[PDB]
Amino acid sequence: PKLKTNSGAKKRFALTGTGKIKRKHAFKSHILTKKTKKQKRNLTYFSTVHKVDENAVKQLLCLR
Amino acid sequence: NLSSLKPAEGAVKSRKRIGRGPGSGLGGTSTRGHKGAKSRSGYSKKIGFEGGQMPIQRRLPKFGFKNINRVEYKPINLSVLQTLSEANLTKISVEDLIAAGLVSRNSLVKILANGTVTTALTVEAHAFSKTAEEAIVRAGGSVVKL
Amino acid sequence: RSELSGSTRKLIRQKGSGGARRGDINSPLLSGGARVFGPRPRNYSFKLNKKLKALARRSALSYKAKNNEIIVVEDFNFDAPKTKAFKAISAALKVGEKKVLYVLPEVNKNVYLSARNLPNTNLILANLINTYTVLASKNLVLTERSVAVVNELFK
Amino acid sequence: PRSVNHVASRAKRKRILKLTRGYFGARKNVWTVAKNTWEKGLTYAYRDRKSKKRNFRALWIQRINAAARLEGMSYSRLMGALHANGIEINRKVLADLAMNHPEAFRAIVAKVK
RNA sequence: UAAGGGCAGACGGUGGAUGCCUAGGCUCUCGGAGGCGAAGAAGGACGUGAUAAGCUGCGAAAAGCUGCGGGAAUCGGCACAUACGAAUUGAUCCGCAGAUAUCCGAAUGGGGCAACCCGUCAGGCCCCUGACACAUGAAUUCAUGAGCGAACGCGGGGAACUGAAACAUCUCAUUACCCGUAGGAGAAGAAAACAAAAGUGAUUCCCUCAGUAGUGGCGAGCGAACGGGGAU
RNA sequence: ACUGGAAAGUAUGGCCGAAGAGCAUGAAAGCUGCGUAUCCGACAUAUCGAGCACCUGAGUAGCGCGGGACACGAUCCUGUGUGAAUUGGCGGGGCCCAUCCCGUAAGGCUAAAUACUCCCGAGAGACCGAUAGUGAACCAGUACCGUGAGGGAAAGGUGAAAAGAACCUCGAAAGAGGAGUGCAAUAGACCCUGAACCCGUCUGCCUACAAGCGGUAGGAGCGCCAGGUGUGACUGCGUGCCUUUUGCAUAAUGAACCUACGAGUUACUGUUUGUGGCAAGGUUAAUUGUUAAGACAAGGAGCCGAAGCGAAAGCGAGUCUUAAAAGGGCGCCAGUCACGAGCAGUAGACGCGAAACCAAGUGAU
RNA sequence: UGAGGGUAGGGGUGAAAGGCUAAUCAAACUUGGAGAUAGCUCGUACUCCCCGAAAUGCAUUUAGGUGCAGCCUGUUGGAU
RNA sequence: AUUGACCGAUGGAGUGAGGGCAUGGGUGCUAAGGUCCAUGUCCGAGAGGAGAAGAAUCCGGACCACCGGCUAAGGUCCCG
RNA sequence: AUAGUAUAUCGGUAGGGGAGCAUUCCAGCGACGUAGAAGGGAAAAGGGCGACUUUUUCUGGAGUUUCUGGAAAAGC
Ligand SMILES: [K+]
Ligand SMILES: [K+]
Ligand SMILES: [K+]
Ligand SMILES: [K+]
Ligand SMILES: [K+]
Ligand SMILES: [K+]
Ligand SMILES: [K+]
Ligand SMILES: [Mg+2]
Ligand SMILES: [Mg+2]
Ligand SMILES: [Mg+2]
Ligand SMILES: [Mg+2]
Ligand SMILES: [Mg+2]
Ligand SMILES: [Mg+2]
Ligand SMILES: [Mg+2]
Ligand SMILES: [Mg+2]
Ligand SMILES: [Mg+2]
Ligand SMILES: [Mg+2]
Ligand SMILES: [Mg+2]
Ligand SMILES: [Mg+2]
Ligand SMILES: [Mg+2]
Ligand SMILES: [Mg+2]
Ligand SMILES: [Mg+2]
Ligand SMILES: [Mg+2]
Ligand SMILES: [Mg+2]
Ligand SMILES: [Mg+2]
Ligand SMILES: [Mg+2]
Ligand SMILES: [Mg+2]
Ligand SMILES: [Mg+2]
Ligand SMILES: [Mg+2]
Ligand SMILES: [Mg+2]
Ligand SMILES: [Mg+2]
Ligand SMILES: [Mg+2]
Ligand SMILES: [Mg+2]
Ligand SMILES: [Mg+2]
Ligand SMILES: [Mg+2]
Ligand SMILES: [Mg+2]
Ligand SMILES: [Mg+2]
Ligand SMILES: [Mg+2]
Ligand SMILES: [Mg+2]
Ligand SMILES: [Mg+2]
Ligand SMILES: [Mg+2]
Ligand SMILES: [Mg+2]
Ligand SMILES: [Mg+2]
Ligand SMILES: [Mg+2]
Ligand SMILES: [Mg+2]
Ligand SMILES: [Mg+2]
Ligand SMILES: [Mg+2]
Ligand SMILES: [Mg+2]
Ligand SMILES: [Mg+2]
Ligand SMILES: [Mg+2]
Ligand SMILES: [Mg+2]
Ligand SMILES: [Mg+2]
Ligand SMILES: [Mg+2]
Ligand SMILES: [Mg+2]
Ligand code: NA
Ligand code: NA
Ligand code: NA
Ligand code: NA
Ligand code: NA
Ligand code: NA
């Protein structure tokens, strides 16, 4: 049958123009005052999935 | 000529066949290694599994929302308008754009500014970028949003 | 294994018998047991692009034209089915000792019945020409009206 | 279609069983015993092709030693005198000359002694 | 030298492989049809031959009886042998319509350990034996039903192993399975409908929409509709 | 005419064909037989106007409490307790209100396009060919096993034709030797062919002072038929094989032997790649038409490519971040459809193997 | 002690041994779900040619399993 | 200088029970064919020669054939 | 393997890659067979190498097969 997309991956990742995968950063949810502003600003940015994990993320999204 | 058919070189290839002796280099363990989960019949990969450590599709948060009234425009750039007109035209329109296979029938068109539109044209599109509209009007054209 | 007529009962207890351990009677290791990875009913058809098939039709006809195995004969219709009548045309055209294909533009029921009993004779309509039937005969006999049909269709 | 290579499968066994004729007991005709014995024998033959060159050179030297000693000279001193004089006759030729043509051997000795 | 033994060959024994073959299977396509039964079924018991174990056919009219159409020299089944017969005044054989059709079995006169035992009532023969009728339940004496049997339909009930690399929500699955009950199909079906200022108008089924919108210890998983193209 | 036991074979020379499908006949038949193409046939039986406010479905719609079905852990159903209005009404458009739009619940009936095969008729197969294919080619759900529910085999072939061996010899007769039939009896009833493991007899060479996985590399003599073949005095070297292991002659695992059987397959959805078609375009799906399942022609719905950035509104070779900018992030500065192949997931998914769990029955001989 | 009845599977029966319930009992037998699951053991068949490891780190209800890295190989582009 | 030995992209893996020896160490008893690390090496996955016979000590990396020659470690009274 | 004959290289478990043989059946062009097919016994000869192939003779008494392409119930 048809391949099924993982429901959690399709709410956490996105594709870019050249094929890289967009992602958010962790450690940004609730324990915030003790962290530095530089740390929090770096964590607020979007990032890309690492090369060693692209295969697993693509399998989760059905090679998308 | 059915007695002398031949396919192109390198077009057909024999399939791999495992577990049929030592000379093939694929017998015995038949490419599976020695023991463990991966050697058994019926093993399949658990796609998100990482051995028990919290997987990447769980360590990371969800983000965003999808708008149920989103509007998307098919981008038709400036250099296409001058190319199509000269090839085939001095008044471009959606029904003409569809007739030349450049856009589907039920699709909305916005004109952008990637190129030059030197030829003087009257243009009927659903949407126009600020720079794209100025490019036509400067080149002695007309812009009709409809 | 799930299609055999034996019961799923375990034949002998797991331990203590002194021989090899055994499950049910349908095992492929047993005489009269299951057939493993045998035939299954299959559909063998696959797709070819439409433009690919048109080009292969033209290549076979080009091969015929190059090998000089194309005869154009005037359109003929029989009053009644007679196998001896159609043998005359083949013998008069000197194509009767090897597989020959007759391309006809219309039904011609009388002609079909006259050529049916002859071993190395094939009849086809000019609009249903395919690659395999062209290459399956040494000689190709086109009727003067089948040329016009082919020219408009497979251009 | 169903494909079973009965004749071909059986022909492979029959060819090898011709090679195991002359063996002791079940090693000549019982298939899994005979094939085991034949395969082990082929390993011996690869090793014994090499040892043949060792055994025949040792036999040439022993015969040359006896022939030289009848003319008051050991093998080591005779060989040292030949290599000193540039004589390139090999040990197989000299041993043959020692055994079957003793007068020619005596001329080689008389040239370096 | 050989009591004996080893190896090779020749010729045999045993055993039933292989090659060749088919009388039986397997998967389908096209068309039809989709029941049988109280006027007694499905399935059985017992019988039935010149000869007769077993199958087949048949039912005390018992390898069979009577017509009509076909057909033309053999025939009395498998199936021999022996024996006696039938048939060109048309046997056997084939198609159609009739006759006969024991006992059990829904079994239905009452019982019963299926193929058995015991009755009432009206008739006719003579301690017996023929040939009728006699269950129950739902309608109005009459009419009806019951039981059996492929799958497909619709209803009533309804698991667990398993997956979640443990497990309880969840999954397996509105599955397996049990029960009730139709038809040649059934169910659905003619808007208190969709849609979004633009429109389509009953139901059913196929291709898309789409692994999308959603749903979810937001885990494993589950998963539409609108719109468009078709069949009808 | 030849070969042959026997022509249908082969070589000549004819003929038919709307019939050159096939099966049978002493080998392989268009012209020997049954048939085939085509045409013709049934006594039976079976089937095929204005106004007006009168009406328009009640323990119903709706609601509370507890459950169920909907993709779903507003809409639909209801066990329990309640409960409207009436065309200016009532219901729906995903809490809810307003407006607007759509529609008329609490009555009913309807063909087609869809699902299936115990069965009848006609066909087919790059399906099996007797340890295969149905459990069952024969006798089969039989024999046999079980109290019962239930479980459940093995087993095909003489020959063209029984012509199935009158009669003799040895034997008490079982068995054979002959004779005869036959192309063949080493086709003689367990009968086509007739392998291996295993078992005999004969012939040739070796062997009773000799000690290890049994061979291998040398090497006389002898025996047969011109240098081939059988044997092997004597010599050198040599602790089987598989699997599992850091490491096995291992006293770790495994097998009596032979013949036969026996374990990465297929479907669908992706992805990479070899080879092709078309190319800023590529490609059809369901289905339809013609012809006779295939073949040819239609079918553009949809899908991918063609612009990105942003959570989004939205801007656009830019965009987001900023009060703005600079900086910075992401972008800008040949695809598509197939064929073959590798791999992945869903299906039992390379094979054999649990202890167990659940459902419906059978058993207190 | 004979004959005939009755109690049926989380049930029966038990002067109680977890005894007995058709040579079977800490949950009978038969058929079905069903080819349950088995991170375990055993097994995996024609040929020749080229290259050729690892038994470490991190994480893990993890420790004889697995994910990623490290180390092999095919194709392709660069020099290093 | 170096037969080319390195890297990127992308298809396919296996391995994630190691072991001996030398050197530097911890632990142990300055025990263990012990155990835990580091640096090399060999066995694993490696035949041939010497050591009487020994996985990793000494010499040495097997394309095939040869009744040719030179050497390594180690040897030259006989078995040899 | 590189360069176009020269230079280098060729021990291997897990494992990756390349190139082939046999088996059953199909399409096409064609052959063989009672003047003896398949199968079975014996012998001889071939192959860069091999999986395997060819020939002769005995048995046997009716089917068999080259090459090119295609598909698997494709090897103990
Ligand atoms: K954890
Ligand atoms: K009764
Ligand atoms: K025999
Ligand atoms: K002696
Ligand atoms: K043991
Ligand atoms: K129980
Ligand atoms: K055959
Ligand atoms: Mg927050
Ligand atoms: Mg390997
Ligand atoms: Mg092995
Ligand atoms: Mg193993
Ligand atoms: Mg391991
Ligand atoms: Mg592994
Ligand atoms: Mg398993
Ligand atoms: Mg079971
Ligand atoms: Mg079978
Ligand atoms: Mg297979
Ligand atoms: Mg024999
Ligand atoms: Mg057979
Ligand atoms: Mg009559
Ligand atoms: Mg679980
Ligand atoms: Mg009915
Ligand atoms: Mg209908
Ligand atoms: Mg709303
Ligand atoms: Mg059978
Ligand atoms: Mg014979
Ligand atoms: Mg025989
Ligand atoms: Mg002595
Ligand atoms: Mg150990
Ligand atoms: Mg290992
Ligand atoms: Mg050892
Ligand atoms: Mg021992
Ligand atoms: Mg073990
Ligand atoms: Mg054993
Ligand atoms: Mg052993
Ligand atoms: Mg064995
Ligand atoms: Mg065995
Ligand atoms: Mg106790
Ligand atoms: Mg008991
Ligand atoms: Mg239990
Ligand atoms: Mg299940
Ligand atoms: Mg199992
Ligand atoms: Mg190497
Ligand atoms: Mg473990
Ligand atoms: Mg890994
Ligand atoms: Mg580990
Ligand atoms: Mg470890
Ligand atoms: Mg140690
Ligand atoms: Mg230490
Ligand atoms: Mg240790
Ligand atoms: Mg090494
Ligand atoms: Mg080397
Ligand atoms: Mg190598
Ligand atoms: Mg096989
Ligand atoms: Na292997
Ligand atoms: Na003797
Ligand atoms: Na009567
Ligand atoms: Na800026
Ligand atoms: Na012969
Ligand atoms: Na075999």
From Swiss-Prot, chain A:
UniProt entry tagged with the keyword Endoplasmic reticulum: no
Keywords attached to this entry: Ribonucleoprotein, Ribosomal protein
Annotated disulfide bonds: none
PANTHER family: 54S RIBOSOMAL PROTEIN BL35M, LARGE RIBOSOMAL SUBUNIT PROTEIN BL35M
Domain of life: Bacteria
Lineage: Bacteria, Pseudomonadati, Bacteroidota, Bacteroidia, Bacteroidales
GO CC annotation terms, alphabetical: cytosolic large ribosomal subunit
InterPro entries for this protein: Ribosomal_bL35, Ribosomal_bL35-like, Ribosomal_bL35_CS, Ribosomal_bL35_sf
UniProt-listed SUPFAM superfamilies: L35p-like (SSF143034)
A GO biological-process term: translation
Protein name: Large ribosomal subunit protein bL35
Gene: rpmI
Native source organism of the sequence: Porphyromonas gingivalis (strain ATCC 33277 / DSM 20709 / CIP 103683 / JCM 12257 / NCTC 11834 / 2561)
One term of GO molecular function: structural constituent of ribosome
Family: Belongs to the bacterial ribosomal protein bL35 family.
Curated annotation (Swiss-Prot), chain B:
Annotated region (Disordered), positions in chain: 1-50
Subunit comment: Part of the 50S ribosomal subunit.
A Pfam family hit: Ribosomal_L27A
Keywords: Ribonucleoprotein, Ribosomal protein, RNA-binding, rRNA-binding
NCBIfam families the record matches: rplO_bact
Organism listed in the record: Porphyromonas gingivalis (strain ATCC BAA-308 / W83)
Protein name: Large ribosomal subunit protein uL15
GO MF annotations, alphabetized: rRNA binding; structural constituent of ribosome
UniProt keyword annotation of Ligase present: no
HAMAP family in the record: Ribosomal_uL15
Protein family according to the UniProt entry: Belongs to the universal ribosomal protein uL15 family.
Transmembrane segments: none
Biased composition (Gly residues): 20-30
Single GO biological process annotation from the record: translation
A GO-annotated cellular component: cytosolic large ribosomal subunit
Superkingdom to which the source organism belongs: Bacteria
Function as written in the Swiss-Prot or TrEMBL entry: Binds to the 23S rRNA.
InterPro entries per record: Ribosomal_uL15, Ribosomal_uL15/eL18, Ribosomal_uL15/eL18_sf, Ribosomal_uL15_bac-type, Ribosomal_uL15_CS
Swiss-Prot record, chain C:
GO biological process, one term: translation
Annotated spans, Disordered: 1-27
GO MF, one example: structural constituent of ribosome
GO cellular component, one term: ribosome
Keywords: Ribonucleoprotein, Ribosomal protein, RNA-binding, rRNA-binding
Record's function text: One of the primary rRNA binding proteins, this protein initially binds near the 5'-end of the 23S rRNA. It is important during the early stages of 50S assembly. It makes multiple contacts with different domains of the 23S rRNA in the assembled 50S subunit and ribosome.
Quaternary structure and interacting proteins, as annotated: Part of the 50S ribosomal subunit.
UniProt family annotation: Belongs to the universal ribosomal protein uL4 family.
Name recorded for this polypeptide: Large ribosomal subunit protein uL4
Species classification: Bacteria, Pseudomonadati, Bacteroidota, Bacteroidia, Bacteroidales
UniProt gene name: rplD
Residues of the full protein shown: 54 to 208 of 209
Curated annotation (Swiss-Prot), chain D:
The keyword ATP-binding is annotated on this UniProt entry: no
Annotated keywords: Ribonucleoprotein, Ribosomal protein, RNA-binding, rRNA-binding
Span of the signal peptide: none
Gene3D superfamilies assigned to the protein according to its UniProt record, in alphabetical order: 6.10.160.10, Ribosomal protein L20 (1.10.1900.20)
Gene Ontology molecular functions: rRNA binding; structural constituent of ribosome
UniProt-listed CDD domains: Ribosomal_L20
Alphabetical list of InterPro entries matching this protein: Ribosomal_bL20 (IPR005813), RIBOSOMAL_L20_CS (IPR049946), Ribosomal_protein_bL20_C (IPR035566)
PANTHER family xrefs: 39S RIBOSOMAL PROTEIN L20 (PTHR10986)
Protein name: Large ribosomal subunit protein bL20
Organism of origin: Porphyromonas gingivalis (strain ATCC BAA-308 / W83)
